[PDB]
């Protein structure tokens, strides 16, 4: 347990900012009871599959002010997981973008070139950016804030079983909608029901909540 805590608090930025004080920062950030203790609710939280983007701080120094300055956003589906038919993957990403296009002045268009603003990639372990995935479960995906090159891109851990219904695996639609939020410039939310909360929860309800819309509206 203390080894899991050490790795979680390190990976997601709490240890850098700071086990008590770092656990307090995590409990505040995740809206858990703020005991300062490695207790059952905190351990359950740490064992919950979630987004690979850090909570406090950032992957790295990025370029620019971290939002898009044009409105026709392009995305490239660089490769495909074998877990779902191509057309089902295409439609999952299209629906995830449709969530954000309704609440922003942005449009999203699928392109077939590396030139895209948002390059979407499936990969496993170390997949080319120095931020390796971790095998099945754990972190499910990550993305990078708007800007040039890797910025704006969205990566999905193909050691996960990608699905869409209730049942085994993880909803590619829900995780993509979350990661696309980062690709548009959002940080994680501390509201457990919000789309931009970092933990994965399956739902058949509408993914966007007030906090997500408030955040994207603030930017655009």
3-class SS at 96?
helix
Q: Is residue 71 part of an annotated ligand binding site?
A: no
Residues 6+ away with beta carbon under 8 Å from 180: 96, 97, 99, 100, 118, 143, 154
Active site residue 63: no
Site membership for Ca ion, residue 83 (CB under 5 A): yes
Site membership for Zn ion, residue 129 (CB under 5 A): yes
Site membership for Zn ion, residue 53 (CB under 5 A): yes
Residue 28 or 58: the one with the smaller Cβ distance to Ca ion is 58
Choose which of 13, 54, 123, 138 interacts with Ca ion (CB under 5 A): 138
DSSP 122: E
Site membership for Zn ion, residue 51 (CB under 5 A): yes
Residue 19 or 209: the one with the smaller Cβ distance to Zn ion is 209
Residue 153 binding partner per list Ca ion, Zn ion, none, with a CB distance cut-off of 5 to 8 Å that depends on partner kind:
Ca ion
Site membership for Zn ion, residue 175 (CB under 5 A): no
Residue 78 binding partner per list Zn ion, Ca ion, none, with a CB distance cut-off of 5 to 8 Å that depends on partner kind:
none
Least Cα distance to 124 among 76, 79, 180, 174 occurs for: 79
Least Cα distance to 215 among 203, 200, 202, 197 occurs for: 197
Cβ pair 198, 53 in contact under 8 A: yes
Site membership for Ca ion, residue 134 (CB under 5 A): yes
Distance CA 121, CA 99 (A): 20
Closest contact distance (angstroms) between CB of 42 and Ca ion is: 20
The rounded radius of gyration (Å) of the Cα atoms in the chain is 17
Give the footprint of Ca ion on residues 139-158 (CB under 5 A): 152-153, 157-158
Site membership for Ca ion, residue 91 (CB under 5 A): no
In 58-206, which ranges are E strands?
A: 72-77, 107-111, 118-123, 141-143, 154-157, 162-163, 170-171
Residue ranges in contact with Zn ion by CB under 5 A: 51, 53, 129, 155
Q: Which residues are annotated as a binding site for Ca(2+)?
A: 83, 117, 134-135, 137, 139, 149, 151, 153, 157-158, 160
Instruction: Report the interface residues with Ca ion, using CB under 5 A.
Output: 81, 83, 134, 138, 152-153, 157-158
């Amino acid at each position: 347990d203390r080894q899991l805590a050490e790795e979680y608090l390190y990976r997601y930025g709490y240890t850098r900012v700071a086990l008590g004080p770092a656990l307090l920062l995590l409990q505040k950030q995740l809206s858990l009871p703020e005991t300062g203790e490695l207790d059952s609710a905190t351990l359950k939280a740490m064992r919950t599959p979630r987004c690979g983007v850090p909570d406090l701080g950032r992957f790295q120094t990025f370029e620019g002010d971290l939002k898009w300055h044009h409105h026709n956003i392009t995305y490239w589906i660089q490769n495909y997981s074998e877990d779902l038919p191509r057309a089902v993957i295409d439609d999952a990403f299209a629906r995830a973008f449709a969530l954000w296009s309704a609440v922003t002045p942005l449009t999203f268009t699928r392109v077939y070139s590396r030139d895209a603003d948002i390059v979407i990639q499936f990969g496993v372990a170390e997949h080319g950016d120095g931020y390796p995935f971790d095998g099945k479960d754990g972190l499910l995906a990550h993305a990078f804030p708007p800007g040039p090159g890797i910025q704006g891109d969205a990566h999905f851990d193909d050691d996960e079983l990608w699905s869409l219904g209730k049942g085994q695996g993880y909803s590619l639609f829900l995780v993509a909608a979350h990661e696309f939020g980062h690709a548009l410039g959002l940080d994680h939310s501390s509201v457990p029901e919000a789309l931009m909360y970092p933990m994965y929860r399956f739902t058949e309800g509408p993914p966007l909540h007030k906090d997500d819309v408030n955040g994207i509206r603030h930017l655009y």
